[PDB]
Amino acid sequence: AQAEIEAERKRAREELRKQVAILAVAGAEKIIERSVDEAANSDIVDKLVAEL
Amino acid sequence: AQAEIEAERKRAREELRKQVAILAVAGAEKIIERSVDEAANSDIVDKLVAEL
Amino acid sequence: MATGKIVQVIGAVVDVEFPQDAVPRVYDALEVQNGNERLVLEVQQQLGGGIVRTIAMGSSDGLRRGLDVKDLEHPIEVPVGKATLGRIMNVLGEPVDMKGEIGEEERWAIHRAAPSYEELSNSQELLETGIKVIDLMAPFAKGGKVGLFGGAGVGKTVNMMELIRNIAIEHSGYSVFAGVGERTREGNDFYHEMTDSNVIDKVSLVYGQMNEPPGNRLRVALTGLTMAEKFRDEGRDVLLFVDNIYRYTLAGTEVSALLGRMPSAVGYQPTLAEEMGVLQERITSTKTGSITSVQAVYVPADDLTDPSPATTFAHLDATVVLSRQIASLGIYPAVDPLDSTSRQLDPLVVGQEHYDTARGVQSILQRYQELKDIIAILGMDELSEEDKLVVARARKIQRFLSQPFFVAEVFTGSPGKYVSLKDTIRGFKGIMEGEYDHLPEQAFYMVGSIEEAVEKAKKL
Amino acid sequence: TGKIVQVIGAVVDVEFPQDAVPRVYDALEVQNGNERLVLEVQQQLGGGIVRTIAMGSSDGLRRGLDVKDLEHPIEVPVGKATLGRIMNVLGEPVDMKGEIGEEERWAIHRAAPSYEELSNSQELLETGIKVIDLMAPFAKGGKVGLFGGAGVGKTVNMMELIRNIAIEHSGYSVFAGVGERTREGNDFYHEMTDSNVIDKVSLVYGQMNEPPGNRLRVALTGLTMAEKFRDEGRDVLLFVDNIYRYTLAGTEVSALLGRMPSAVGYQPTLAEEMGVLQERITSTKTGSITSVQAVYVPADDLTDPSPATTFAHLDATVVLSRQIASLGIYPAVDPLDSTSRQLDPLVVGQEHYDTARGVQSILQRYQELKDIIAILGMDELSEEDKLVVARARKIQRFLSQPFFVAEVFTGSPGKYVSLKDTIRGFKGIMEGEYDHLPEQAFYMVGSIEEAVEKAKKL
Amino acid sequence: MQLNSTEISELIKQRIAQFNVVSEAHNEGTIVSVSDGVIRIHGLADCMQGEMISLPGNRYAIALNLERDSVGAVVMGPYADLAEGMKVKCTGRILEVPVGRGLLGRVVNTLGAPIDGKGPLDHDGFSAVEAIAPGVIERQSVDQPVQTGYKAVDSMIPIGRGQRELIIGDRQTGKTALAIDAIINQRDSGIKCIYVAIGQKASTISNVVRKLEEHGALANTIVVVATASESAALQYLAPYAGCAMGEYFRDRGEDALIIYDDLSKQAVAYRQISLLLRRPPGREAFPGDVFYLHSRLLERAARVNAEYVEAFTKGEVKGKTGSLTALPIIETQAGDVSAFVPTNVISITDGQIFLETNLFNAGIRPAVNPGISVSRVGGAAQTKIMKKLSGGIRTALAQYRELAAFSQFASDLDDATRKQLDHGQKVTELLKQKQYAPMSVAQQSLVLFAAERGYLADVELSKIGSFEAALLAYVDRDHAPLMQEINQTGGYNDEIEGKLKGILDSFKATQSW
Amino acid sequence: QLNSTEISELIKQRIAQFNVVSEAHNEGTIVSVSDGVIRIHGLADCMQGEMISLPGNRYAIALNLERDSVGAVVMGPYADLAEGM
Amino acid sequence: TNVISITDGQIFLETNLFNAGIRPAVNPGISVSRVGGAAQTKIMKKLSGGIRTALAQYRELAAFSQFASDLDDATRKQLDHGQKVT
Amino acid sequence: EFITVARPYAKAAFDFAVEHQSVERWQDMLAFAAEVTKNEQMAELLSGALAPETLAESFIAVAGEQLDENGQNLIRVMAENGRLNALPDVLEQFIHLRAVSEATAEVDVISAAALSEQQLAKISAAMEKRLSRKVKLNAKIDKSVMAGVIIRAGDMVIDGSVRGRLERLADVL
Ligand SMILES: Nc1ncnc2c1ncn2[C@@H]1O[C@H](COP(=O)(O)OP(=O)(O)OP(=O)(O)O)[C@@H](O)[C@H]1O
Ligand SMILES: Nc1ncnc2c1ncn2[C@@H]1O[C@H](COP(=O)(O)OP(=O)(O)O)[C@@H](O)[C@H]1O
Ligand SMILES: Nc1ncnc2c1ncn2[C@@H]1O[C@H](COP(=O)(O)OP(=O)(O)O)[C@@H](O)[C@H]1O
């Protein structure tokens, strides 16, 4: 089971790369009480994949 | 042994959500970093003083 | 209006700064609002320029600096008189039994001067307790003080419960019970015992429980004492039970250390023998009335010499020492007949009949101690006729000093007995003369009065 | 960029600009003339001051010198490079050989391994010492401690444990000398180097001569080296020369740091100072440390605060005593105070446990008679008590043994006794089947068969 | 399962959503000192005593000195990272700890953080660490047994639900073993157990937890850990964190048992904290209020009558009395009980179990010294079968202790006393017991009846233990219904006495040991 | 750091005019009361072992003559003395 | 004890022996030399052997062998030599 | 440190300066008396164990800007108590007491940027409703507080910064 959950874990690491950006934008918006359809997505993805 | 397996699953879910939280708030900061704006910023000031 | 402000809070010690026209006097009581709860502080020292150092009569947590302190201009003062009988109160004279307002007519400050040497009156009226060994071997008079000495588990507390029951049921005397540093478990046991025995309506209870700051455990003895003084000034004869002098002195040590005084003999405060005297000098039989007292005094590690029990002996008139060894053989009240003593035990006051019966019991037992260690090595049969007879009478006396209590009725189920002094003397003298030599020993165990021995001997 | 402003004994106060003040346990530096001196900061007082301990001779420091703020704690070489070499408390090489070629340096202040990571093992360790593994067996990965006054045998015993377990163990080994003789450290280094095992052992030495800062922080350097080896996945032997000197060096400095004294003069932080060290010397799921610690007890008082707080940190405690050594019975282990966590039927098996408890029962019954024997003489005993005494006085001798490292003192060649071979001997003596042999037949022998032989020759 | 990363991400979204971004005014101060775990904060005009001050990083300090121009606060965690000039906030909060039913079977440090690595807790909310015990009028007299499973204790030194019994003795005499057998024996009794360890080394906590796991007990108990490496504030506050977790049960009509291991190390941690705050020291350098430190901890062990429960649970639980039982442990140097902390806690508690190192060496295990051990609750807490039978053991041992002096001249004695002097030794050899082997009340009652009624008068001393084992085995198969009855009710009757006499008669003849 | 019984308004008086010996030095004022001992400020010409006469017709014995104040013990009930007398 | 812990041995001079005219009153059994024989000339090392344990044994043997004695010829020669030595 | 020993002298000096309506003169008298304490040499002489009044005289000699009775007397008392090094803090406590008595306070505005001067108006006005005093702003700028504003008054702060929102959120997660 312990070497199986290790497969589950890296599948989840693959998946979460997509949710994290949505989380970042939602947090930023609730913090600043405003919507921002940010332009320079470059910075978003540069973090979206580097440390993940 | 089954209890131990379930405990490892809980532990891994938690240590995963920690990573995503870290990257999430760092990204929200990088988002504010370029959505920040003299007009919206002055609006923050206005709202906090009005609430003061 | 409130005219002072807190400036330090270190544990249970609080400092308050007043304008120099309004400094509280020593022992004055202050009040502060600990949020949604009222708290009173007792001034211990005036130091510096309007600053005052105080002990909190309550939990210290939650105090900010700068809170407004309003000073009462009178010491802690408590309700007194009949209104308090049957109630339970804390050091501040507030009810802790949920039955509501005390209905006091009058309030007295707990700090007052002891009677003058002029006001006392020496009267030798013996108390009658209903407990064979104490009435026989350690008599004590009105106005006197009795110290129950012993280690842990020997029966100080149940002996005091039985004394309360006897005095209140047979002689109708008001009693004040002051629990200095009281185990809340034993305090609830006491409350339910006295309410079951139906004596409660002739006792007033004061509890300073162990979980309370030192300032509470220290002053409680004075609250009980003040209630007793009110009853004396009504011309009654009251009786004051203090549940431990040892914990009174420990509270004194704590308060001393907290105030930062330089310690003394074995750690105790410097003022130990003054605190003890300030207390034990208010308990006296002024001409108007009387206060008698019996006081439990734990002896730590069986030394009888550390300053706390060593300093109290100077104030006691009779001392009853309880031993765990005797208790372990099952003969309660577990009093040691040889070690207990009294100043009132001399012919002039107790009468020759009593004095001689007491000294006879002592002689018999003191010889039986010699003989135990012959019987061990040689066996019984090598003794003389009178030696075997001294042994039989010694064992019968040693049995007959046990008694069943109305308050121990809950541990053993057997109903209690009250034995008048006439009957105690008559019984022991009858045993020593050899009138009852024809009964077996067990006829005397837990028997109560002497007639009950001749009755119990039938059924055995 | 900071100035000295006081010098009290070993502790030095340094003043920095308000914004630059160093953190706790950072290491500063001073040029003590034609020299270099390292200070370890211990406290931050207010106002940009900081109060430190000098890792060197404090003499020669003026007020107003200039100190440099290294921005990191003390760090020592670590790994295979450290191996077979002698090192200072600062991790400098102290033999005459070259630089330590280490790849990596670790700070000597670290946290203990999480409770989540500990490991627990019952695997017994055999030692060739009758008394130690009869009464106080200990396990691979555990802690052992030798308690005793001055001059009773807690160093010779540690050298025998080294000889017995450390040569017959493959992995690396670390020896920390804390505040004990330099002569003994030199003898040890040369014995190693002349038996070619030096290249498995690492040495660290802050011996009696050094100032209090060295004797204070050297044990942590030793621990850091052992902790590296542990975390590589190896298993390690860690011997500490005298751990009492660490708390003593703490006491020497305590007052100068401005701390109110405590029970018998000791520092207030005694138990924390000792826990924070004793708690990182442990085994773990990734590796394991077996450690033997000598613990001096001052004035032979086993209730002094320092031994009394150490008893709680050890698995197997061996307690030496002067009243046994004065009878010539080495090793002077007292069997009525030695003890082990491992002495359970479920671990050592019924027979060994039962033999150990029988020996203890006899020796205690013998203690209970010594007052009547002292007063009235041996003739007033019951006829069965004379037998208890006659067997205890044999058990005491048979607990004696000659050591390979004690040939220097007594000529007699050392012996190695296997456990199987000693529980049999004690079961024999207790059961009274060697009950026809003189006392001196048992003194300083190996197995029970060397005793039955020694009896023939007187 | 975990592949449902939707759970993870949506849950993060829930934490985001409920973040109310409004601002709150707070009071502030600055660190001006750092040393040995104490910090001095200049500012915080509105700090309260006992308040939790909040440092940088998720760290806190307990403000203990409100001096005129400073606040002395003790850091609850590794302090070496703090620095002069850091900024600090005064929350309004007091220290609160997780509590509830889910903690059973978990290991937690003194802040209720899980330390065993089995993932987050499932608590039932939070509770204040520092509280005040139930008053005089809310107690109920203790009259129920809590069984230890030791012949030596449950007969001569009963412990009742709601009592506070001190285990005291020198190092390495079984103080921990006795308490942990007391905990194991509750594996099926309805009593929840809490074992709080002060200042022990972690690889020992792990060992006793591994033993509670061997036997069934771990699933029933909470472990609170403050290892020897943790700062003094945590070691000192751990017992309150444990009591607050036992009171969750007491205040809801259930029974609990709490075991403070080494109050003699809480006292040491508190001494360190006091001396670093420069408070005036007392005897042995202990601060003044070290009585009031333990007093208000132990007086939380209580039995509360059903009306206080109904008032607290707002009518949800009726007619049940809650109870919290405490067994603090103390360590005495060289058997000396006249030191400061022993002499306080001996005064606070309801009884004492004195463990002697001589008895422990001589073979007597557990080493309880019957002649100076006491229990003020006494027989009121026993099952009435035990209450009946143990009275005679008290006297047998008391006569043995009075005669024992002659044992060293015994051959000279007279048989009329030799009978007693041998019955004492046989009953003493009877109270020896092996570790991790608890006895049900039926077995202790049977084995004491055997010795009280003279059956052992002829068995030889060295065999008493095999006699006992054989008897306990026999009865378990050939008379099981009687054991079931006794264990289930504890009653006593001439009928039961006849059945026991029959069992002993049949055993002593028809079998062997 | 300890203050030595120099306090707000005494310092104000000294602000008024430094040498205050214009006041007759036969007399003083209490500045502290505790445990039966009092600190008296003033009393320049107190002599060690002297009798100091308190209000209410009581006496104190001057035992400590210090650089700024006289420490004395009270010969009777002290609880009702107050700073300023 | 502090100093017994720093040195390489001790010569313990006992006052009981010294009053009995045994001078120097070297008490064997407590006194030891932690460097041992490594320091001695070869002749001295050969001759001395473990002599000091011989006198330690003789001196404790005299502890029981005053009011009574057993094995009373071999203990007798042990005592004789120990006495002529001292 | 000298905060706790400056308090009595500060309070006494202020009481006197109120009774003589000369607060404003005392304040600068004390500032000068403080700066004399900071001189390289005087600070040496202040540590040397001179007898009190000789030290007092050597100190007065250096001051002609002290009003010849009351300032001298303060200095002389402080010399009697060896507390001359406390002047730097007697000054601060005098200033604070003046503030408290005149019911005038000072509050700090720390911001990502300078404000639009009606923001400052609203701020100060509402502060005089948090606090009763006449409030004197002194805004400052920083960018660690990338957005929002911080209002720090005495030791009570209201955290409106966005940084204090980010980190305050992160610790929830
Ligand atoms: N009933 C018993 N029978 C036999 N051995 C026992 C018994 N109880 C305890 N022991 C043994 O005594 C040893 C010490 O036990 P334990 O650690 O519980 O004592 P302790 O007082 O906790 O010591 P410490 O104070 O160091 O924790 C243990 O190894 C245990 O095996
Ligand atoms: N006369 C008696 N009859 C029965 N039990 C008694 C008697 N006296 C004392 N005890 C027992 O002694 C125990 C403690 O008694 P207590 O008076 O509290 O002792 P202490 O004097 O130490 O307080 C109680 O459990 C009680 O059962
Ligand atoms: N097995 C042994 N045989 C003989 N002598 C021994 C033995 N063990 C220790 N000793 C003696 O113990 C004495 C004390 O030495 P040491 O162990 O260094 O004490 P310490 O522990 O203080 O260092 C030594 O001089 C040595 O002769």
Ligand SMILES: [Mg+2]
């Ligand atoms: Mg009692």
Ligand SMILES: [Mg+2]
């Ligand atoms: Mg040594």
Ligand SMILES: [Mg+2]
């Ligand atoms: Mg333990």
